[PDB]
Motif scaffolding. Structure first.
Motif, short mmCIF file in Angstrom:
data_model
loop_
_atom_site.label_atom_id
_atom_site.label_comp_id
_atom_site.label_asym_id
_atom_site.label_seq_id
_atom_site.Cartn_x
_atom_site.Cartn_y
_atom_site.Cartn_z
N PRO A 1 6.65 3.59 6.07
CA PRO A 1 5.75 3.72 7.22
C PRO A 1 4.60 2.74 7.15
O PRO A 1 4.16 2.33 6.07
CB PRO A 1 5.26 5.17 7.13
N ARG A 2 4.10 2.36 8.33
CA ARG A 2 3.01 1.40 8.41
C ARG A 2 2.25 1.60 9.71
O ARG A 2 2.81 2.07 10.71
CB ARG A 2 3.54 -0.04 8.33
N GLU A 3 0.97 1.23 9.69
CA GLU A 3 0.10 1.30 10.85
C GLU A 3 -0.04 -0.10 11.43
O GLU A 3 -0.43 -1.04 10.73
CB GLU A 3 -1.28 1.84 10.46
N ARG B 1 -2.13 -0.19 17.55
CA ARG B 1 -2.34 1.18 17.09
C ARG B 1 -1.07 2.02 17.30
O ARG B 1 -1.04 2.98 18.06
CB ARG B 1 -3.53 1.83 17.79
N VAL C 1 5.80 11.70 9.16
CA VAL C 1 5.91 11.03 7.87
C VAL C 1 6.31 12.02 6.78
O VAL C 1 7.16 11.72 5.93
CB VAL C 1 4.59 10.31 7.52
N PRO D 1 -2.54 10.11 18.30
CA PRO D 1 -3.54 9.06 18.56
C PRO D 1 -4.86 9.58 19.10
O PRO D 1 -5.91 9.01 18.77
CB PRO D 1 -2.83 8.16 19.58
N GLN E 1 -12.39 9.17 13.66
CA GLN E 1 -11.26 10.03 13.32
C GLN E 1 -9.97 9.21 13.36
O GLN E 1 -9.59 8.68 14.41
CB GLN E 1 -11.17 11.21 14.28
N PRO F 1 -5.99 8.34 13.45
CA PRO F 1 -4.90 8.99 14.19
C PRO F 1 -3.94 9.77 13.30
O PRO F 1 -3.04 10.44 13.83
CB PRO F 1 -4.19 7.82 14.87
N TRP F 2 -4.11 9.73 11.98
CA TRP F 2 -3.29 10.52 11.07
C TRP F 2 -3.85 11.93 11.00
O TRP F 2 -4.91 12.15 10.40
CB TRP F 2 -3.26 9.88 9.68
N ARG G 1 -13.30 7.88 8.78
CA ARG G 1 -13.32 6.58 8.12
C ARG G 1 -14.75 6.13 7.87
O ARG G 1 -15.66 6.38 8.68
CB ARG G 1 -12.59 5.54 8.97
N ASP H 1 -7.69 -6.21 2.42
CA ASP H 1 -6.47 -5.80 3.11
C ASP H 1 -5.22 -5.89 2.24
O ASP H 1 -4.14 -5.53 2.71
CB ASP H 1 -6.28 -6.66 4.36
N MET I 1 -5.31 -1.85 0.24
CA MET I 1 -5.64 -0.58 0.89
C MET I 1 -4.42 0.33 0.89
O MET I 1 -3.32 -0.10 1.25
CB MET I 1 -6.13 -0.82 2.32
N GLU J 1 -2.07 2.85 2.44
CA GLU J 1 -1.74 3.32 3.78
C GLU J 1 -2.20 4.76 3.91
O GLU J 1 -1.95 5.59 3.03
CB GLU J 1 -0.24 3.20 4.04
N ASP K 1 -1.33 7.32 5.20
CA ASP K 1 -0.37 8.41 5.00
C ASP K 1 -0.25 8.78 3.52
O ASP K 1 -0.18 9.96 3.18
CB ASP K 1 0.99 8.01 5.57
#
Lengths: 52, 16, 52, 1201, 92, 155, 103
Positions: free
Chosen positions: E13-15, E20, E40, F25, F57, F59-60, F113, F122, F125, F127, F129
């Motif tokens: 998975p990836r963002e 978005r 996920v 989202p 906030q 989106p996860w 965040r 970058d 980081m 992810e 999740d």
RNA sequence: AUCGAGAGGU
């Protein structure tokens, strides 16, 4: 008849001997001897008493 | 084999 | 002797009726446990409570 | 048209007519000799040596290849070659008498070949070999001698009638099943082990880092039969790692390889392929979720070559080039990984499939979807009999012999000496190795004694016929006998019908040593190729073409733990396979287990699977006999008719085999019992059948009979039925009458004590010179007998007597498990016995000079003559039969010359030249010389055996026992006039206390007494077989029909006063046994005598005049008493009192001369300040042992404040 | 749960911040795809042929027969299975 | 019984019935129909702190379903468990929940965040999740709602 | 760290340091903990087994003392002839093993 | 005699 503090264990798959069906929790299947020494043990009871 | 064993047993005096 | 281990016929009827009633009770216990009608004892899983 | 118990016993009689009680030993040995030896020879058939051309600079350098091929093996019959060189056929009794191993010589056809490389400039290994020289025919070469199991197909007694057995001095009752090594009989105890090629998942207990472990113990069918074992461990969840990783432990790898890396090394590089191998259901997300962490762990390696490099770097070799590491990794992956699946090139797909299967099973147990495996399930264990064990031993020994031959080849080639085939083989290798392993039981090479197995071979137990029968059927589980693991010791459910529930020793070996049931059959193994061919032709989809996604509902097919492929209709396949086995188109040993929940069809054909026979119930849908046994009454009548008929061909009668080959009897092992429903008797089948036909199955039931549970309404079809429940018992548990009326430990106690009962063990005990023998004068067969006794031949060779027993409190001399024995009955021969002992001696020799002579030693020349009598020896130094000896009387006179250079203080006069090495009789024994056998040994030296006999009459202190665990000693004997009598004048032989009965609950003893009384009165034998409809009420009615009180009571009168006792006595015949425990064998007293040389304390043992141990607990008891002087006396004055002189300066033992009264300490130059210390000699020994380690334990007698 | 269409490895998975969105991207190659939903993480906290299974005379809803095997779970509740049509029941 | 409840140790896993990590989202809206009512009620009342933090906030959405029966047995209210979670993780985790009468007991969580972290790392980081999976693992086993530690069960 | 070195350090320790260490200077000095002389127990401690015959088979301790003295003689001979240092170590680490397994 | 192995007794 009590083995390790519990009724006769399912040493086969879900039965104590190949003479009962699967998932038999009835007294006879799990080692309850309703006979006396005078009257005599049946073969299943004989085996369970031997285990104890 | 049984016959051979019989023969060997009976004649153990002769075969000795 | 072997005569001192023998109980009269009426007493053996008493014993047989006792064992029959015990078998009956275990039968309804199995039925209840097979329908989630047996409330587990505190801190005791359903199988353990049924076994006890 | 319902089968009866008489019919069941006719079937069992046929079984035992065609089956011997030593059948397992004999058939295993026959399989080893007939087939396994040839396979072992073939697996190392060729020996090749390549003599390359050294660069010595001389013209003529040519490479050579020498080859030796081992051909067929020939086994002759056992023979002996004497000192004079004469070779004769050897017989078992002569081997037993003269101390000879009863072994047959083995020859192997060897052929030699020599080839010359076509060109010497070719690289090594690429040379073309041209045939230079070749042997035209093979040379039959003697390579060793294999001990021959008695009564086996290669024994001289095979196929020999009873009359010729007598002519050979052999008991027709003896069943064979053992070996004669140096005269001693040795039985191989079956060895229990866990089965190979089975995947077992075991849950590791916390706080172990491993959560679950899937293990397979992979063994090649015949290629050394077990080398490689693998593990697949799931690691426990850690607070640092959110997932559990699967790591494969492989042979010759120092680290646990993550599973994905080993998958990649097998060519399954993509993740989708790996998870298709492991997770056969894409829709099941828990499996894939648990597999994700290991994929994460193993991403750094994405190709086969890198995976192979990763494996190689972790090999046992470090500091090696990458190419060699990759080669080694591929070699391990091909050969040492799952060798039972295959070991040849191009088979990575099947090994990957099986690895995925193992992972799937382990994760099923980790998800708690299935329960872990039971290490003690009997269907997952195998019994190694004499066959497989001797096969492993012979493989090792033949490899050693071939190594010797190759070394001979190399040495001869180096020196250019001619190579001779006969001189090449050191035949002593196989002969000596087999002899040593069978003699000592230490199983393996002599040089690896500690690492070898022990106790595989045991001296056969010749105390009673039943004890020998038991010893021939004994299995040992090699678990730790000190570690307290009750689970292996426990009686498992799967032991039903395979192992005797009762017979197991008491003590450390309780539950570990087991005994086969009466009808238990141990498989010897059969080829798996025919079964695989039938599977292939019937629609088995090979594993190479198998795609799990296409067929996820199809059933996996295994054979000997090898996943061969997948079938779509496993039910029909299983019925066809079972039908074939029911015609013997497939071997009857083949286990065909269809696991419906796991979607498996496991086939097994290997050796070691314990099986038992069962009736088959007719289950065919269209049959008119649904729920009825296949075996009709017609088949039973055929068995009766063909039993007597001897005019028929011996191999073409209708017997046991005709029932198996006709599909009426089936052998099942514990694995297959899990898929069958077995009725306990034909009456149970019938009752279930009417219950299923709508009939109420109700009637007036004899209240005295056993109560059975009502037929289970949830059972609509029985697949099998038992021939008789009594067949679940062993040899000795089958001698107990009414064992089902006893408390089980009493059955176990009787099974243990029946081995020690005195009887006639073999009919030929007269001609056998055993070390020890105990014979009952007048053995009687029991009045109450089990139907199984006919096959154990207990009536033929019984080990007890029917004594008239009264259960009574008479004078109080039978309390606490004592008995009172009639003295008149003793005087008339009751329980009288003969004790035979045998003393063996022989002439020794070293070099060319004999240093021993059987002669009557003379005081005037022989030095150090014993204190016994030399007057009973004859001129040849021996003692004649019929003479009387006692204590230390010399029975064999032997002398050994002394070197002429020795001068023993002048005590050896010029006449004294020899020394006495004679053999005195045991100090604690006396008797009459029964026999004196004289012969020559293997080395042609004189060899004598002296057998003494001594009658033993029952006396106070001698063990006797019933067949129900009721053991006691004689406490007192009363004469005929002094014992209670009945109104007929019956006086009991034995009086036992009533108090023995209640707590022990040995109701079988009372039922036996009543039944024996009935049978003695009526003359009909009493059937005491368990699980019969013989009730105590029926026996009571029979007893009352003879004019006796129905329950066995009798009015008795007092012997002393003639007055009629207030209580009525339980009086009747009961079978009692004289046990080998006689008080005179045990009584021992020591005042003073021999001491150990090192510690100077009383020696050990009654036989050697030794003292009794005053242990730690006795010392504690005397401490709690407060008896300081008692301890001082017992531990100092009575054991090892000693005196030393210590130096008051340094505290060390000084140099003391009491003759001159001079004491000195050289270290301190001390001659005046000394102390005298009384201490145990062991204490001074301990202090000297400490001083030998530079520790100075100093004794100071004055406070050095 | 998806695999790369190029090398058949696992898609992680990836963002995708610019749009978005949630993507499944192979960490071996450059392939990437748009998630359908891609939840996920999920953290939950033929038997009629067996002759050893107990039988009952219970009614089968589908084919209205009466023969049925049954077995406990692996709560000692019984799952029944018809012997004529193979349908699995519940105690109701 | 009250003292027994005060003694028996009950962590989040004890009360947790299930956990999830959805991609929702819109903090104000919800991809779950079951979550519409209580989220709407929560956002019906304006709040300056929530109004500001809305943009932080992620989106996860870490979702947690809790068994009503276990809440009744342990006598736990959704407000209590929510407050315990918040105090266990202070500000890093914005949280919302429904009412007790709701037929399903659901806690919705997001990671607030940090705006002080420059986007210049970058290459390492985690992810979000994976970070949330670690967070859920820590929640289930670390946070204690009541009771005495190491006293698992009381009779 | 050879026995020679440790022995030298232990003889170089002061009495006060021994007292501070809790080591007895009169009976258990540290350097004595290094074997320079090996006591030989009397045959009484290690008797010979005579099996009713002309046997002088000796005891395990006798055999190990024979091995220890053989290894000691080997080391002395190597140090005498001027053998290579590795040859000397071959017997040094063998004498040490014999003594260790003797005790 | 020593050592090792095994079978047993309470």
């Amino acid at each position: 008849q009590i083995v390790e503090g519990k009724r006769i264990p399912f040493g086969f798959k879900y039965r104590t001997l190949p003479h009962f069906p699967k998932d038999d929790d009835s007294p006879e299947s799990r080692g309850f001897i309703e006979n006396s020494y005078l009257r005599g043990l049946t073969p299943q009871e004989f085996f369970f008493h031997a285990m104890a | 084999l049984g016959a051979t064993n019989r023969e060997l047993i009976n004649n153990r005096a002769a075969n000795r | 002797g072997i005569g001192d281990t023998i109980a009269d016929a009426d007493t053996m009827k008493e014993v047989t009726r006792t064992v029959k009633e015990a078998r009956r009770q275990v039968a309804e216990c199995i039925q209840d446990a097979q329908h989630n009608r047996l409330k587990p004892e505190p801190g005791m899983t359903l199988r353990e409570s049924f076994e006890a | 048209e319902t089968l009866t118990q008489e019919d069941c016993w006719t079937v069992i009689s046929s079984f035992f007519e065609e089956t011997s009680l030593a059948r397992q030993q004999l058939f295993s040995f026959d399989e080893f000799v007939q087939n396994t030896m040839q396979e072992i020879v073939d697996d190392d058939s060729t020996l090749t040596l390549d003599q390359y051309a050294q660069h010595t600079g001389a013209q003529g350098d040519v490479t050579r290849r020498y080859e030796i091929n081992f051909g067929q093996i020939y086994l002759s019959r056992p023979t002996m070659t004497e000192a004079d060189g004469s070779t004769t056929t050897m017989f078992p009794q002569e081997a037993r008498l003269r101390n000879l191993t009863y072994s047959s010589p083995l020859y192997v056809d060897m052929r030699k070949k020599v080839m010359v490389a076509a060109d010497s400039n070719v690289p090594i290994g690429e040379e073309e070999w041209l045939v230079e020289e070749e042997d035209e025919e093979p040379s039959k070469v003697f390579i060793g001698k294999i001990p021959i199991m008695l009564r086996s197909t290669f024994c001289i007694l095979n196929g020999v009638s009873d009359s010729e057995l007598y002519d050979l001095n052999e008991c027709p009752y003896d069943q064979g099943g053992y070996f004669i090594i140096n005269g001693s009989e040795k039985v191989i105890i079956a060895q229990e082990r866990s089965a190979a090629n089975i995947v077992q998942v075991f849950k590791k207990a916390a706080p172990s880092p491993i959560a679950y472990v899937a293990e397979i113990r992979s063994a090649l069918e015949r290629g050394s039969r077990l080398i490689s074992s693998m593990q697949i461990k799931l690691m426990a969840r850690n607070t640092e790692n959110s997932g559990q990783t699967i790591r494969a432990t492989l042979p010759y790898i120092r680290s646990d390889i993550p599973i994905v890396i080993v998958f990649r090394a097998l060519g399954v590089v993509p993740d989708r392929d790996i998870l298709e191998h492991i997770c056969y259901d894409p829709n099941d997300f828990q499996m894939l979720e648990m597999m994700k962490p290991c994929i994460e762990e193993a991403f750094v390696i994405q190709d086969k070559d890198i995976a192979l490099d990763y494996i190689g770097k972790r090999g046992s070799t470090t500091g090696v080039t990458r190419e060699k590491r990759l080669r080694y990794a591929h070699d391990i992956l091909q050969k040492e990984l799952l060798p039972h699946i295959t070991t040849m090139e191009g088979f990575e797909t099947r090994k990957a499939f099986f690895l995925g299967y193992m992972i799937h099973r382990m994760l099923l147990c980790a998800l708690e979807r299935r329960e872990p495996d039971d290490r003690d399930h009997f269907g997952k264990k195998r019994l190694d009999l004499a066959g497989p064990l001797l096969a492993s031993l012979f493989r090792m020994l033949f490899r050693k012999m071939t190594r010797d031959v190759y070394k001979y080849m190399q040495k001869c080639v180096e020196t250019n000496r001619e190579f001779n085939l006969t001189l090449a083989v050191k035949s002593n290798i196989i002969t000596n190795g087999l002899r040593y392993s069978l003699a000592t039981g230490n199983w393996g090479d002599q040089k690896r004694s500690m690492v070898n197995r022990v106790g595989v071979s045991q001296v056969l137990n010749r105390y009673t016929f039943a004890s020998t029968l038991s010893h021939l059927r004994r299995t040992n589980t090699p678990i730790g006998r000190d570690g307290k693991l009750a689970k292996p010791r426990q009686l498992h459910n799967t032991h039903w019908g395979m192992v005797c529930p009762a017979e197991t020793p008491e003590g450390q070996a309780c539950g570990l040593v087991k005994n086969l049931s009466l009808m238990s059959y141990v498989s010897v193994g059969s080829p798996s190729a025919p079964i695989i061919e039938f599977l292939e032709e019937w629609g088995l989809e090979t594993l190479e073409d198998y795609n799990p996604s296409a067929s996820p509902n199809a059933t996996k097919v295994f054979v000997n733990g090898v996943w061969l492929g997948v079938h779509r209709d496993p039910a029909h396949l299983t019925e066809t396979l079972r039908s074939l086995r029911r015609r013997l188109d497939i071997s009857a040993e083949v286990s065909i287990v269809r696991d419906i929940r796991e979607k498996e069809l496991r086939l097994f054909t290997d050796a070691g699977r314990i099986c038992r026979p069962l009736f088959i119930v007719d289950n065919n849908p269209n049959s008119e006999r649904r729920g009825e046994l296949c075996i009709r009454k017609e088949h039973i009548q055929q068995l009766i008719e063909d039993k007597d008929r001897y005019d028929i061909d011996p191999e073409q009668r209708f017997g046991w085999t005709a029932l198996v080959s006709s599909g009426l009897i089936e052998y099942l092992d514990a694995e297959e019992e899990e898929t069958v429903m077995i009725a306990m008797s034909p009456e149970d089948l019938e009752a279930s059948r009417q219950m299923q036909a709508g009939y109420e199955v109700k009637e007036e039931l004899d209240p005295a009979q056993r109560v059975k549970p009502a037929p289970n309404p949830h059972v609509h079809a029985w697949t099998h039925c038992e021939i008789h429940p009594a067949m679940i018992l062993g040899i000795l548990a089958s001698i107990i009458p009414f064992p089902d009326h006893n408390q089980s430990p009493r059955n176990t106690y009787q099974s243990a004590m029946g081995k020690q009962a005195m009887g006639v063990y073999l009919t030929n005990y007269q001609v056998r010179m055993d070390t020890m023998a105990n014979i009952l004068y007048y053995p009687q067969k029991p009045l109450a007998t089990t139907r199984s006794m006919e096959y154990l031949k207990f009536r033929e060779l019984p080990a007890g007597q029917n004594a008239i027993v009264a259960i009574l409190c008479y004078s109080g001399y039978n309390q606490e498990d004592s008995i009172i024995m009639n003295q008149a009955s003793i005087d008339r021969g009751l329980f009288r016995s003969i004790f035979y002992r045998t003393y063996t001696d022989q002439e020794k020799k070293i070099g060319m000079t004999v240093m021993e002579e059987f002669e009557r030693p003379v005081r005037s020349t022989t030095l150090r003559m014993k204190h016994g009598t030399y007057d009973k020896l004859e001129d040849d130094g021996l003692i004649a039969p019929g003479t009387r000896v006692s204590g230390e009387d010399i029975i064999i006179g032997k002398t050994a010359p002394i070197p002429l250079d020795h001068e023993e203080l002048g005590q050896r006069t010029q006449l004294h030249a020899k020394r006495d090495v004679s053999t005195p009789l045991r100090s604690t024994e006396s008797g009459i010389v029964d026999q004196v056998m004289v012969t020559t040994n293997q080395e042609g030296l004189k060899f004598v055996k002296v057998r003494m006999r001594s009658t033993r009459i029952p006396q106070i202190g001698d063990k006797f026992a019933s067949r129900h665990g009721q053991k006691g000693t004689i406490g007192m004997t009363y004469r005929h006039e002094d014992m209670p009598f009945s109104a007929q004048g019956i006086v009991p032989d034995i009086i036992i206390n009533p108090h023995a009965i209640p707590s022990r609950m040995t109701v079988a003893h009372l039922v036996e007494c009543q039944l024996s009384k009935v049978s003695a009165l009526s003359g009909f034998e009493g059937d005491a077989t368990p699980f019969t409809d013989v009730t105590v009420e029926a026996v009571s009615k029979l007893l009352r029909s003879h004019g006796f009180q129905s329950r066995g009571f009798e009015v008795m009168y007092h012997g002393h006063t003639g007055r009629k006792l207030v209580a009525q006595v339980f009086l009747g015949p009961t079978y009692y046994q004289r046990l080998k425990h006689l008080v005179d064998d045990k009584i021992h007293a020591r005042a003073r005598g021999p001491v150990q040389i090192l510690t100077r304390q009383p020696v050990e043992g009654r036989s050697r005049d030794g003292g009794l141990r005053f242990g730690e607990m006795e010392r504690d008891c005397q401490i709690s008493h407060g008896c300081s002087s008692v301890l001082r006396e017992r531990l100092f004055d009575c054991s090892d009192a000693y005196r030393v002189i210590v130096c008051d300066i340094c505290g060390l033992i000084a140099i003391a001369s009491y003759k001159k009264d001079s004491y000195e300490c050289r270290s301190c130059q001390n001659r005046t300040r000394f102390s005298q210390v009384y201490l145990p000699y062991a204490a001074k020994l301990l202090f000297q042992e400490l001083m030998s380690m530079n520790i100075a334990p100093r004794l100071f007698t004055k406070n050095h404040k | 749960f998806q695999y790369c269409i190029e090398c058949n490895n696992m898609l992680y998975p990836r963002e995708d911040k610019v749009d978005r969105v949630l993507r499944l991207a192979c960490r071996n190659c450059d392939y990437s795809e748009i998630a359908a939903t891609s939840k996920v993480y999920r953290h939950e906290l033929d038997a009629s042929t067996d002759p050893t299974l107990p039988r009952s005379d219970k009614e089968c809803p589908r084919c209205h027969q009466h023969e049925a095997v049954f077995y406990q779970t692996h709560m000692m509740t019984l799952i029944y299975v018809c012997v004529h049509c193979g349908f699995a029941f519940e105690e109701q | 019984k009250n003292v027994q409840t005060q003694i028996e140790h009950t962590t989040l896993s004890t009360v947790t019935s299930a956990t999830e990590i959805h991609y929702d989202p819109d903090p104000q809206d919800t991809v779950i129909e079951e979550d519409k009512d209580f989220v709407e009620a929560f956002f019906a009342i304006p709040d300056e702190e929530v109004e500001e933090n809305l943009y932080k906030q992620s989106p996860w959405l870490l979702r947690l379903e809790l068994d009503r029966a276990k809440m009744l047995d342990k006598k736990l209210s959704m407000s209590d468990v929510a407050g315990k979670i918040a105090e266990s993780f202070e500000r890093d985790l914005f949280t919302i929940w429904s009412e007790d009468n709701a037929d399903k007991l659901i806690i919705r969580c997001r990671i607030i965040r940090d705006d002080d972290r420059k986007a210049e790392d970058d290459d390492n980081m985690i992810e979000e999740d994976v970070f949330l999976k670690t967070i859920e693992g820590h929640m289930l086993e670390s946070i204690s709602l009541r009771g005495v530690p190491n006293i698992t069960r009381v009779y | 760290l050879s026995p020679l070195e440790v022995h030298t350090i232990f003889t170089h320790i002061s009495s006060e340091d021994l007292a501070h260490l809790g080591l007895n200077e009169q009976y258990a000095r540290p350097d004595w903990m290094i074997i320079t002389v090996l006591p030989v127990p009397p045959p009484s401690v290690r008797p010979s087994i005579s099996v009713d015959g002309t046997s002088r088979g000796e005891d395990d301790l006798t055999h190990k003392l024979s091995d220890i003295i053989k290894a000691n003689a080997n080391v002395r001979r190597c140090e005498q002839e001027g053998a290579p240092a590795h040859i000397v170590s071959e017997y040094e680490q063998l004498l040490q093993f014999h003594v260790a397994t003797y005790m």
